[PDB]
Design an enzyme around this catalytic site. Structure first.
Site, mmCIF file in Angstrom:
data_model
loop_
_atom_site.group_PDB
_atom_site.id
_atom_site.type_symbol
_atom_site.label_atom_id
_atom_site.label_comp_id
_atom_site.label_asym_id
_atom_site.label_seq_id
_atom_site.Cartn_x
_atom_site.Cartn_y
_atom_site.Cartn_z
ATOM 1 N N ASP A 1 0.809 -1.217 0.000
ATOM 2 C CA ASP A 1 0.000 0.000 0.000
ATOM 3 C C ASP A 1 0.843 1.267 0.000
ATOM 4 O O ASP A 1 0.429 2.297 0.559
ATOM 5 C CB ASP A 1 -0.892 0.020 1.242
ATOM 6 C CG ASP A 1 -2.340 0.069 0.911
ATOM 7 O OD1 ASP A 1 -2.703 -0.488 -0.139
ATOM 8 O OD2 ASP A 1 -3.098 0.665 1.716
ATOM 9 N N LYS B 1 1.889 4.539 -0.864
ATOM 10 C CA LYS B 1 1.344 5.661 -1.617
ATOM 11 C C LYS B 1 1.506 6.873 -0.724
ATOM 12 O O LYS B 1 1.723 6.746 0.484
ATOM 13 C CB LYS B 1 -0.139 5.471 -1.996
ATOM 14 C CG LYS B 1 -1.079 5.288 -0.778
ATOM 15 C CD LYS B 1 -2.512 5.102 -1.330
ATOM 16 C CE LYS B 1 -3.428 4.413 -0.363
ATOM 17 N NZ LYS B 1 -4.815 4.429 -0.981
ATOM 18 N N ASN C 1 -0.290 7.325 2.580
ATOM 19 C CA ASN C 1 0.038 6.495 3.728
ATOM 20 C C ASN C 1 1.340 6.923 4.375
ATOM 21 O O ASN C 1 1.980 6.129 5.067
ATOM 22 C CB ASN C 1 0.051 5.035 3.300
ATOM 23 C CG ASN C 1 -1.361 4.537 3.110
ATOM 24 O OD1 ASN C 1 -2.290 5.148 3.658
ATOM 25 N ND2 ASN C 1 -1.540 3.454 2.390
HETATM 26 C C1 LIG Z 1 -9.828 -1.053 -1.888
HETATM 27 C C2 LIG Z 1 -9.986 -1.443 -0.422
HETATM 28 C C3 LIG Z 1 -9.425 -2.832 -0.125
HETATM 29 O O1 LIG Z 1 -10.108 -3.622 0.427
HETATM 30 N N1 LIG Z 1 -8.058 -3.144 -0.527
HETATM 31 C C4 LIG Z 1 -7.387 -4.426 -0.303
HETATM 32 C C5 LIG Z 1 -7.830 -5.619 -0.905
HETATM 33 C C6 LIG Z 1 -7.161 -6.839 -0.696
HETATM 34 C C7 LIG Z 1 -6.017 -6.876 0.126
HETATM 35 N N2 LIG Z 1 -5.114 -7.960 0.550
HETATM 36 C C8 LIG Z 1 -4.103 -7.409 1.408
HETATM 37 O O2 LIG Z 1 -3.219 -8.033 1.899
HETATM 38 N N3 LIG Z 1 -4.385 -6.004 1.540
HETATM 39 C C9 LIG Z 1 -3.688 -4.949 2.274
HETATM 40 C C10 LIG Z 1 -2.595 -4.333 1.564
HETATM 41 C C11 LIG Z 1 -1.849 -3.341 2.464
HETATM 42 N N4 LIG Z 1 -1.399 -3.931 3.713
HETATM 43 C C12 LIG Z 1 -0.896 -3.009 4.399
HETATM 44 C C13 LIG Z 1 0.044 -3.497 5.569
HETATM 45 C C14 LIG Z 1 0.990 -4.487 5.355
HETATM 46 C C15 LIG Z 1 1.831 -4.945 6.369
HETATM 47 C C16 LIG Z 1 1.726 -4.317 7.622
HETATM 48 C C17 LIG Z 1 2.591 -4.784 8.802
HETATM 49 N N5 LIG Z 1 2.667 -6.088 8.959
HETATM 50 C C18 LIG Z 1 3.359 -6.640 9.963
HETATM 51 C C19 LIG Z 1 4.037 -5.800 10.842
HETATM 52 C C20 LIG Z 1 4.824 -6.356 12.034
HETATM 53 O O3 LIG Z 1 5.288 -5.598 12.818
HETATM 54 N N6 LIG Z 1 4.930 -7.768 12.255
HETATM 55 C C21 LIG Z 1 5.667 -8.211 13.447
HETATM 56 C C22 LIG Z 1 3.994 -4.426 10.720
HETATM 57 C C23 LIG Z 1 3.252 -3.903 9.669
HETATM 58 C C24 LIG Z 1 3.236 -2.404 9.526
HETATM 59 C C25 LIG Z 1 3.523 -1.807 8.283
HETATM 60 C C26 LIG Z 1 3.493 -0.429 8.210
HETATM 61 C C27 LIG Z 1 3.204 0.345 9.332
HETATM 62 C C28 LIG Z 1 2.942 -0.249 10.564
HETATM 63 C C29 LIG Z 1 2.944 -1.623 10.626
HETATM 64 C C30 LIG Z 1 0.770 -3.327 7.865
HETATM 65 C C31 LIG Z 1 -0.071 -2.899 6.834
HETATM 66 C C32 LIG Z 1 -2.511 -4.549 4.397
HETATM 67 C C33 LIG Z 1 -3.280 -5.571 3.524
HETATM 68 C C34 LIG Z 1 -5.573 -5.695 0.726
HETATM 69 C C35 LIG Z 1 -6.246 -4.473 0.513
#
Ligand SMILES: CCC(=O)Nc1ccc2[nH]c(=O)n(C3CCN(Cc4ccc(-c5ncc(C(=O)NC)cc5-c5ccccc5)cc4)CC3)c2c1
Length: 383
Positions: free
Chosen positions: A220, A222, A225
């Site tokens: 994500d 962009k 964010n």
């Molecule tokens: C149009 C509206 C909609 O529904 N969009 C959609 C559709 C299908 C999806 N499938 C799918 O994975 N994501 C999303 C894509 C973006 N990720 C966004 C996402 C991805 C990974 C993390 C994340 N993971 C693990 C850790 C960790 O510390 N582990 C120990 C930390 C973070 C983290 C990242 C940045 C800031 C703070 C925390 C957080 C957010 C989340 C999932 C989808 C989005």
């Protein structure tokens, strides 16, 4: 030991354009469930695709013989939706997937927060801006429906509290008070190469950590964010929720080609996102834009990225490498991942350990006096 458990053709509903598409999927015993446009010829696995701890639902709507894999990944509920020809086929997939998941198995309350603003609403919950009453500090609270269901880095929004109510699961994340990067960019029109290098280096450091320590693709990346903390350092946010799209999920201008195409994807997706963000920072415009979605998809998939005569050769090299259509040719898309970008001449002289340790001083200091200063929430100043 890692082996294929089941493989074959499925119809997958697209993640951003919500249409049905034939994809060849491999289920492996390490939990990965990954789909390809064609059967692959065939490296640390990515959690994005894991079926570990997911729930399987069989449904007849919108389409008969559908099955859904729903997972909580960090703080976001994700769903992958599939169709096959026969109920017998569906049963074969769902029991195989569930067998793989099984084999992987081996006080703060709402009263403490003041509600400020609805940030977002999604299928399985909402995200609200809150202030902890005892400290005046600001948080994004993700409030998820309980039924459907923090290693610190300096440049990721930290998960601070988690708790549940009778029917909700709440995740409380630190909310940067240094203002949105889209607000700062639009005020200043364009950033210098130096200022973009500073922000780009912090994003690279955060993506390297996510890819190499947490084995996750952010997907994500962009401008929306990205925020600044009170001192002017980057925070990548975690405020999203899955939405049923609008009759297409969200807006396409930032999506990597292979994501747009519901193709296999990996860590290279985030380097594309880094290229989109840095292109806009230094050019003052998005790389691809057009009112028509059909035209916009074809721009993203097919049109060669053009650059202003303003841009230096190092920046053009970085951006053209980050924005290669083919993730296998994209800068950062090889096995060295982030190190390919850290070693690019655009970042020459950057000491990467000093990036992580915040020893480099931000080129821009947001106009706040402390972490509780409301300036970037005051309607008058936000214009
Ligand atoms: C149009 C509206 C909609 O529904 N969009 C959609 C559709 C299908 C999806 N499938 C799918 O994975 N994501 C999303 C894509 C973006 N990720 C966004 C996402 C991805 C990974 C993390 C994340 N993971 C693990 C850790 C960790 O510390 N582990 C120990 C930390 C973070 C983290 C990242 C940045 C800031 C703070 C925390 C957080 C957010 C989340 C999932 C989808 C989005």
């Amino acid at each position: 030991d890692v082996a294929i458990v089941k493989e074959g053709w499925l119809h997958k509903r697209g993640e951003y354009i919500k249409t049905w598409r034939p994809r060849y999927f491999l289920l492996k015993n390490d939990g990965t469930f990954i789909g390809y446009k064609e059967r692959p010829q065939d490296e640390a696995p990515l959690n994005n695709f894991s079926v570990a701890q997911c729930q399987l639902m069989k449904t007849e709507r919108p389409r008969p013989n559908t099955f859904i894999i729903r997972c909580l990944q960090w703080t976001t509920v994700i769903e992958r939706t599939f169709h096959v020809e026969t109920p017998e086929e569906r049963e074969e997939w769902t029991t195989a997937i569930q067998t793989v998941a099984d084999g992987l198995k081996k006080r703060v309350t709402m009263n403490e927060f003041e509600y400020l603003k609805l940030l977002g609403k999604g299928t399985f919950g909402k995200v609200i801006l809150v202030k902890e009453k005892a400290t005046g500090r600001y948080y994004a609270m993700k409030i998820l429906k309980k039924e459907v269901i923090n290693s610190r880095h300096p440049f990721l929004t930290a998960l601070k509290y988690s708790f549940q109510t009778h029917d909700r699961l709440c995740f409380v994340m630190e909310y940067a008070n240094g203002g949105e990067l889209f607000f700062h960019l639009s005020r200043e029109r364009v950033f210098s190469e130096d200022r973009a290098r500073f922000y780009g280096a912090e994003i690279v450091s955060a993506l390297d950590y996510l890819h190499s320590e947490k084995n996750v693709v952010y997907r994500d990346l962009k401008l929306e964010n990205l925020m600044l903390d009170k001192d002017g350092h980057i925070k990548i946010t975690d405020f999203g929720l899955c939405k049923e799209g609008i009759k297409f999920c969200g807006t396409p201008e930032y999506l990597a080609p292979e994501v747009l195409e519901d193709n296999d994807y990996g860590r290279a997706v985030d380097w594309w996102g880094l290229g989109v963000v840095m292109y806009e920072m230094m050019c003052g415009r998005l790389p691809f834009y057009n009112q028509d979605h059909e035209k916009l998809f074809e721009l993203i998939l097919m049109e060669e990225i053009r650059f202003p005569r303003t841009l230096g050769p190092e920046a053009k090299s970085l951006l053209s490498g980050l924005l290669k259509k083919d993730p296998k040719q994209r800068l950062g898309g090889g096995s060295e991942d982030a190190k390919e970008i850290m070693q690019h001449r655009f970042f020459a002289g950057i000491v990467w350990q000093h990036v992580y340790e915040k020893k480099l001083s931000p080129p821009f200091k947001p106009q706040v006096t402390s972490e509780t200063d409301t300036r970037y929430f005051d309607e008058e100043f936000t214009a």
